[PDB]
From a paper:
The structures of apo AtSPDS1 and AtSPDS2 present the PEG molecules (absorbed from the crystallization solution) bound within the active site. The conformation of this linear ligand mimics PUT, providing the information about the substrate binding mode inside the catalytic pocket. The bound PEG molecule stretches along the polyamine groove, resembling PUT bound in other SPDS structures. On the other hand, both apo structures, even though there was no ligand in the dc-SAM binding site, presented bound PEG fragment inside the polyamine groove. The asymmetric unit of apo AtSPDS1 contains two dimers (A-B and C-D), while the complex of AtSPDS1-CHA and the apo AtSPDS2 both present four dimers (A-B, C-D, E-F, and G-H) in the asymmetric unit. In the apo AtSPDS1 crystal structure, dimers A-B and C-D (symmetry-related dimer) form an additional extensive buried surface between N-terminal domains of subunits A and C. This covers about 8% of the subunit surface and involves 12 hydrogen bonds which is recognized through PISA server as the interface important for oligomerization. Additionally, the SAXS results showing dimers of both AtSPDS isoforms suggest that these additional interactions are rather the consequence of tight crystal packing of AtSPDS1. Similarly to the other SPDS enzymes, also AtSPDS stabilizes upon ligand binding. This feature is even more emphasized when temperature factors of the two very similar (in terms of resolution) structures are compared – apo AtSPDS1 and AtSPDS1-CHA. Apo structure, where no cofactor is bound in the binding site, has an average B factor significantly higher than the complexed structure. The estimated molecular weight of the full-length AtSPDS1 calculated from the SAXS results is 74.5 kDa, which almost ideally matches the theoretical dimer mass (73 kDa).
Numbering used by the authors:
A (entry chain A): 37 to 299, 303 to 330
B (entry chain B): 40 to 297, 304 to 331
Write the structure that this text describes.
């Protein structure tokens, strides 16, 4: 315990210049798949204590043990803030748990999903079968392709909500954090329609987040809000979300119209009406920058 | 000299099996074995100075504000005009600095059993150990379990238990007799705030503490949590309890606080801290 020379065997360490000088490590019981698509390095492993894990370019995308915090917040923060959402786009794929979360909403008629990397969808469907059932809902339209693009095929004003479940800005998601993409989402949303994006750590990425929020305040003339939640296996143990609405009926992201936990899937594991409001209560160092 | 990344510090414990937060080490500043525990201080590359006790991260300069502001302001902003407070558990004096932010306070007793924690924190974290210099502080080097047993019944407005984990010297601080001793020491409507671990890692431990507190404390019993990146799972929680007496609403601060501005705590995040995820709320509010 003295000098850090003896490496204990059997660990995956998540190291990146996006979180310099630190790493989250998980003990690996077995590698289920490891390969390299046209887009990124793809790992599925069985961890000792977080269940199965998807890793892309050495970055943890999800674990079975805590994906409920991310998947339920990214989905229910937007969808519980608008009445009777019917048509939803999800940009970015995975184990389908976000599709299952969208499908909890009885009003939903069409769930479009765009994921560039068919490799990630294929191995996710095979190794997370209990959650990849989300792909089998008859409302789901899965497109393998670029999200930036898919939107250009998209009818103006046709979506109630767009959920951007992206990887980090280093990799295939790079342009999903930039202005043209956000302009493209705004066009696709109805008046008063909402976007919810993966918006990184207030502990690690304040400069990046400042630029996201600035870009959003300029494009989205309705509400622009930033929420955060606990996800142990994302860097610093938190991740945030941009919530924005376009010009049109007013949206109050902080007080949900229709909280999904209030009323097939199990009970919500994480989301409830009170933690929906709590997610907008940022620490003082952040609240002063973001607001 | 075990780590999972050559040259890095990795926090490994059976209290969080199968995971480790690792920090790159610029230089080891101190290594020692007290009468109670192994003590390390190191300059991390990106989190400033880090205090480690028995291989467990106790604080880092970069995020200690989240823990030190919530553990002090949650209890003290929930009661009117607190005057006399007890801190159990030593550190860099950051908790003392946050208690001192309250003008109403007249007396801050602190009891830390391990002289080496205090000495190391004063030597290596001097910019924050100015907490110990406020003239209201009464630093006792002593067993805090003993100190509460010998405390005058009804004499404290608040007790803050800023402890290490249940494996090591702090073991008894998590058990029912210690909690009964705290209830005895608090005035009617007096409050306790204890370090109460991770809802993601420790639900069985937290369920038992909650159950013990409901048995002992007939005022309010509530659990709060906050973000601290360098505690395992990225969160830590607190037991807030008040004794029978004047009502205490821990969720809405009756005594909101205004030398640097608060970095983390504010009135809105005070209430937010009590909004637990559905899996926990169900167990804790049972």
């Amino acid at each position: 315990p003295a000098c850090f020379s003896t490496v204990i065997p059997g660990w995956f360490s998540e190291m990146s210049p996006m979180w310099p000088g630190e790493a989250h490590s998980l003990k690996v019981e077995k590698v289920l798949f490891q390969g390299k698509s046209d887009y990124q390095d793809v790992i599925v492993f069985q961890s000792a204590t977080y269940g199965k894990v998807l890793v892309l370019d050495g970055v943890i995308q999800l674990t079975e043990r805590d994906e409920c915090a991310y998947q339920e917040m990214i989905t229910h923060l937007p969808l519980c803030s608008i009445p009777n959402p019917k048509k939803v786009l999800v940009i970015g794929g995975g184990d389908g748990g976000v599709l299952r979360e969208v499908a909890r909403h009885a009003s939903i008629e069409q769930i479009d999903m765009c994921e560039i990397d068919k490799m990630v969808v294929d191995v996710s469907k095979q190794f997370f079968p209990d959650v990849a059932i989300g792909y089998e809902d008859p409302r789901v339209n899965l497109v393998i392709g670029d999200g930036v693009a898919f939107l250009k095929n998209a009818a103006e004003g046709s979506y109630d909500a767009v959920i951007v479940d992206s990887s980090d800005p280093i990799g295939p998601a790079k342009e999903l954090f930039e202005k043209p993409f956000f302009q493209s989402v705004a066009r696709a949303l109805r008046p008063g329609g909402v976007v919810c994006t993966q918006a990184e750590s207030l502990w690690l990425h304040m400069d990046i987040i400042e630029d996201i929020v600035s870009n959003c305040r300029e494009i989205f003339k309705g509400s622009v809000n930033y929420a955060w939640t606990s996800v142990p296996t994302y860097p610093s143990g938190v991740i945030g979300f941009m919530l924005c609405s376009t010009e049109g009926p007013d949206v109050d992201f902080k007080h949900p119209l229709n909280p999904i936990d209030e009323s097939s899937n199990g009970p919500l594991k994480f989301y409830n009406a009170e933690i929906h409001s709590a997610a907008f209560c940022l620490p003082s160092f952040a609240k002063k920058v973001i607001e």
